Every structure is written in structure tokens, then in C-alpha cells.
């Protein structure tokens, strides 16, 4: 009925192998052409088996943790959209990867911080007023989710849901930015900006730092750490298999059509900033762009045409809406895959609420 | 306040942790160790004593396996607080348990969708046949055990031995019915413990055979792998931890300890796996007995011996200090355990105090 593409198991800012892959999806009735070198080394490949409508529902990747738990890691965008395809077409697909959690570390004197035994980053902003010697801590980018297919070689984007800014160490106060989205092919998907920690990859550009996530047609890799922090005690938060900037104090921003620009200093408060998304025209938005996602991305390809009411509200609040918000509601309460599985009511919980502060409201 | 914290190193499953590991563990701290290649003190850290001294050694155990289900309660590693007399120069050999596998969440789809309730092949394998024998897979790790012993002309000698807590099964509603197990004499020969499908635990000197059967320390303390049927159609991986733990298949194995934890003969998803029989030497003072409450991989805290979630500990420190015997345990549980006086593992100090209650010495 139904394929559901995940991260095989990979984990951080390299991708899945073809064995990975092939352990993810053994009795199941998909298969998947996992690249072995080059640029496409770790997107999934996948052949359509008939010439019909599809719904392809792209979900990015989750931002890193700060060195507090005084946070909720910056959720993974969604993007749903329906789109045409003909049999034995190849679908190459990057579920991006979640940016990595500062805590918990397996180094005693890091992890010493995460549990509050240790307080020399405090010490350092009370003392200087900012943090030069003791880097790190801030929550990698994480990665953006990428489908698309090939064009006589040249690579044509159909969706990217993009990955969430990594947490910054010393966060404290939550996100008020809207969901960013894209759909003429006409503006660049150029990276986003790099300082102390890395900037988020675009869908096409020129990485030259190693803490900056690369961009998809750049191989798509999580972008190192920051050097200070290395060096000082090894404290590695790498971006995710998208877009995903690797953060040092700062986090690093996600990945998406352009990457989520990362703190131009080392400023312990300064989160990493979300992906861009992106629609493609030659396909229709069923829902707008809305974070919803937890850890790794993933994409669902279907085949395009009570008391669990009641127990929605109790997770989110009275929520707003619009008589023109209405329309992507239902599409959203009962035509998604995060609405009707009562496991992933949590999502369609965050999902509602994004709708409605959402633009189109 | 100086301490000496062995952890896991960032290692798991049946195979221990290597020397850059360990170094990579403690890189910025006034800890090193000496970590085995080969043979059977592969993964056991060795340290040497910096002082002539009266150490307390906190030796605590791995933590099992989640069942069939995302949401289940893992069975909690033990924990083992002594008194011990120790020379400088000493070489101690510590072995920091690994927590066994969980079942869930899983890689594969199809182990996945059993995870979130959807897929229910299981519960009509019971339904169509009475004895499971073809769906077989959803069990627990058995949690590794943690052993900090010496070397006496090249025999191995035990000072502490935290058993590690058999996995839990597949439909694991009900709790068990069992307290912690010590041993305080070598005279008691610590043996691996009865595996039936799902391996068994692992003692302190044996002559392990069963692949899926946890081994012993004189063998390596190497995890034991999952059962061969279960391997069969989905692969459902769930092997014990480093330290003797025990591979679950569906009801989930035993834990290691001094005397290897005990499973079942016949796969049941309702019964779960033993936990171990912890040790302490008798040339060494016990200061809190064997409870229950690590929540993951093991862990060994040494150190010189001297002379707003509150609330959910005053429900237990209330009846504890003036009702038993054991008030005094209480109060050094209380006041001495890093459970208790780190703000962060508060959890564990409420998993402390529950388990003094329960607990038949009190």
C-alpha cells in the first residue's frame, strides 16, 4: 500500500550504506539503490512500480540539544505534496539526519557539565561576559529531507522538508520565527551563514569550512565541530546527513533548499536557525511548511486518491484559527499520517499548533 | 571530593570497551586505565591504586532489556556499596557491565511495526499453535554485571560484584515477585546460571558451551548472543550485555553476576529473565546492601572512605527513618550515595530508597 523511507539506521552527518538499507527493509516489500561513492553516497534510489498519482510526504530532521535540558530540540519541518509519475522512474531520496545532542557525552569531564558538576562555561560568561576558552555544547543543525530525481544528469528538486537549527548551550527562550518555504526554482539554494558554529547546506553551492554542512549536490554531509571546542575538551555536535551545520557554542543551523544561517560569533544564548523548504511547481502543496519532527526525517509515498478528538485538545491549547485555515486543517486532521496513527498523535499535536501561527492564517 | 568514576567507556552490547576508548572516556580528567586486547581480560580496566588508604568502592550493575512493547520498564541494575582497606600500587581490575538489548525501538520495519502495536503475528502464534517456536523474538538483554577484583600470584581473587538485571519480555504486564541476591563467602562456588532458549547469566568461574548462554569472568564475561530461531525469519538481535549477561529471545534472559541469573525452559512471553547474585568479599565492610536502580550501563565510583522532585523522595523518607532497624542505612544512603547528593540522578536515589523498603533485611 504504502513505502515509508527512514535513515536505515544511520545516525549523525554520513548516511546509510546499501547493507544498512538492505537490514532496514529486509521483509519488507521495498528495495532501495543506496550509492556507494560520489555525491550520491547515501541517498536511497527508489523505482516507481506504476504511472499514477502519488502524495509524497517529506519530513526533515530535528536539531541538536544544548548542554541544559532547559530546551526542546527545534523540530524537523514537513512538507506534503501530490505529484505525477511514470512507471520505472528513479525517486533518489536523502531522509535527512537528526544533529547531534550535546549531552549525554561520553567524556567524564563533558558529561560532568551535562549532570551540573562541572560550571566553567558559567564561570566564563559571569566572569568575561563570553565564551572564548571553553567552545562548545551548542547542538549540531540537523538535516533537511530531499526528493527528488535526475533530469538528462542534472538533478531536479521535486520536495525538501528542511532539518531544525541545532539548540544552543546556554538557550533558554523558544523559537518565535515562522516556517520559511520556497517555489520558484529562480533564487539560488545557496548555505547558510557560517560563524562560530557552521551554517545549514543548501541545495546547491560551494562549502568551504569544515564546521559548515555541505550542500546536496556537495554530497549532503554534517558539518564538523568548531576547532576551539575540539581542541579544548572534544566536544563534538555534528550536523545531520542533510544540510546539517555543525555547532560549536552556538548551534549550528539546518539543512533545506537554503541552509539555516548559524550565529556569526560564539554567543552561548544564539540558537542555529532552521532550513528553508522547498515545492517544487511542477507539484501541488497539500500542507503548508510546519515543524513537527522529533528526531530523523523520513518520507511516506502513498497512492494519491472520537475519543480521539477529544484527545487533542488536551495536548495543545486553545488554538486559533481562520474560516481560511479551515482547508488545510482538514487536510491536516484526518488526510496525514501523523493525525491517524494514535502513536504519532504527539505530532499531529505540534503539527495543529504551527498551523495556527502559520502565515496562511 | 576527588573520585575515580569507571564507566562503560561509551561501549555496549556482548563485547566491552578498548584502551582509546577508555582514553577517549577519561581525556581531561585525573583517571587512567589499562584496557585488555585479548583473551579474557579483554575490556576489563585495570587501575592502579595511588594511595595507601580505606577506599569505599561503588560498584553498580547493567540495567535489562525493554520487552516487545516501547513502553516497558526495564529491570534496574544492582547496586553494591563496600568498604574496602586497599595499598598503594594495587592493581584493580574493574569490569563496568553493559545494559542488555532492547527490543524496542528497532531498525527493521517489521520488528518496528510490532514495536508500535500495529503488527500483531505474536499474539496469534499463541492463538493457532500452543507451544511458540517459529515467531520467535521480543525479549530483553540481560544486563551485564560490574566486577572489580584483584590478582593473587595470577589466580583472580573478588572484592565486589554488582549483578546486572535479566531483560524483560515480550508481554511483560505483570511485575515479578523476587529481592536481590548477595553472596558474602567464597566458599559458595559462583556458577553460570540455567539457560533454557533464551541464554542464562554468567558467573564468576565456569566452563560456558551455549552460544546463546551468557560466558563467565574467567572466560571473558562476554555477552551472550540472541537464540538461532529467532535469527530465523525477521533477525530480531537482542544480546546480552558485556559482563555475563544472557541473550533473550522472547521471554528475555538473565543477567551476570558472582552466580549467573536464571531463565526459563520453554519460551513465555509472560516470564522474565532471573537477575545475578551479587558479591562481597568478607575483608571488606558492607555499607548499604543490594538494591536495585541503574537505569542503563554500569558503573564504579572509588573514593577515600571518611570516618522541585523532592517531594517524590519524602514519600519514602518518611516511614524509612524511625521504623526499621535499618535507619542508619538510610541515612548514609541518603547523605553518601552521588544517587543522592547529585540534584540530576534523582531518579536514581528514588529508585534507592523504594528498594531499601521492599527489601527483606528491613
Redesign the interface.
Same mark, same amino acid.
Given at each position: 500500500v504504502h513505502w515509508?523511507f527512514?535513515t536505515? %539506521?544511520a545516525s549523525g552527518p554520513h548516511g546509510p550504506t546499501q547493507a #544498512?538499507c538492505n /537490514? =532496514?527493509? #529486509? /521483509?519488507?516489500n521495498?528495495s532501495v539503490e543506496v550509492g556507494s561513492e560520489g555525491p550520491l553516497k547515501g541517498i536511497q534510489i527508489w523505482k516507481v512500480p506504476a504511472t499514477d498519482t502519488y502524495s509524497i510526504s517529506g519530513y526533515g530532521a530535528a536539531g541538536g540539544k544544548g548542554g541544559k535540558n532547559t530546551m526542546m530540540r527545534s523540530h524537523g519541518v514537513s512538507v506534503l505534496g501530490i505529484f505525477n509519475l511514470e512507471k520505472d522512474d528513479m525517486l533518489y531520496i536523502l531522509v535527512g539526519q537528526q544533529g547531534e545532542d550535546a549531552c549525554p557525552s561520553? /567524556? #567524564?569531564?563533558i558529561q560532568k557539565v551535562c549532570? %551540573?558538576?562541572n560550571n566553567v562555561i558559567e564561570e566564563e560568561i559571569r566572569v568575561n561576559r563570553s565564551v572564548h576558552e571553553w567552545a562548545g555544547g551548542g547542538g549540531g543543525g540537523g538535516g533537511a529531507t530531499y526528493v527528488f530525481k535526475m533530469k538528462d544528469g542534472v538533478p531536479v528538486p521535486l520536495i525538501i522538508a528542511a532539518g531544525g537549527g541545532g539548540r544552543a548551550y546556554g538557550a533558554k527562550t523558544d523559537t518565535f520565527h515562522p516556517e520559511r518555504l520556497e517555489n520558484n526554482s529562480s533564487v539560488l539554494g545557496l548555505n547558510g551563514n557560517s560563524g562560530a558554529a557552521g551554517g545549514g547546506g543548501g541545495w546547491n553551492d560551494n562549502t568551504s569550512l569544515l564546521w559548515a554542512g555541505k550542500s546536496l549536490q556537495e554530497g549532503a554531509t554534517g558539518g564538523h565541530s568548531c576547532p576551539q571546542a575540539m581542541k579544548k575538551? %572534544?566536544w563534538e555536535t555534528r550536523g545531520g546527513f542533510g544540510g546539517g551545520g555543525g555547532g560549536c557554542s552556538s548551534g549550528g543551523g539546518g539543512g533545506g533548499y537554503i541552509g539555516g544561517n548559524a550565529a556569526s560569533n560564539n554567543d552561548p544564548e544564539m540558537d542555529g536557525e532552521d532550513g528553508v523548504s522547498f515545492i517544487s511547481p511542477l507539484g501541488i502543496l497539500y500542507t503548508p511548511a510546519l515543524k513537527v519532527m522529533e528526531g530523523h526525517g523520513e518520507v511516506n509515498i502513498k497512492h494519491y486518491l472520537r475519543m480521539k478528538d477529544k484527545f487533542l485538545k488536551h495536548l495543545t491549547g486553545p488554538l486559533y484559527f481562520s474560516p481560511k485555515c479551515s482547508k488545510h486543517f482538514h487536510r491536516l486532521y484526518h488526510n496525514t499520517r501523523d493525525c491517524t496513527?494514535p =502513536?504519532y498523535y504527539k505530532r499531529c499535536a505540534r503539527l495543529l499548533t504551527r498551523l495556527a501561527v502559520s502565515p496562511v492564517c
Open positions: 515509508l527512514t536505515c %539506521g #544498512q /537490514n =532496514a527493509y #529486509q /521483509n519488507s521495498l561520553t /567524556n #567524564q569531564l549532570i %551540573g558538576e575538551w %572534544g496513527i =502513536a
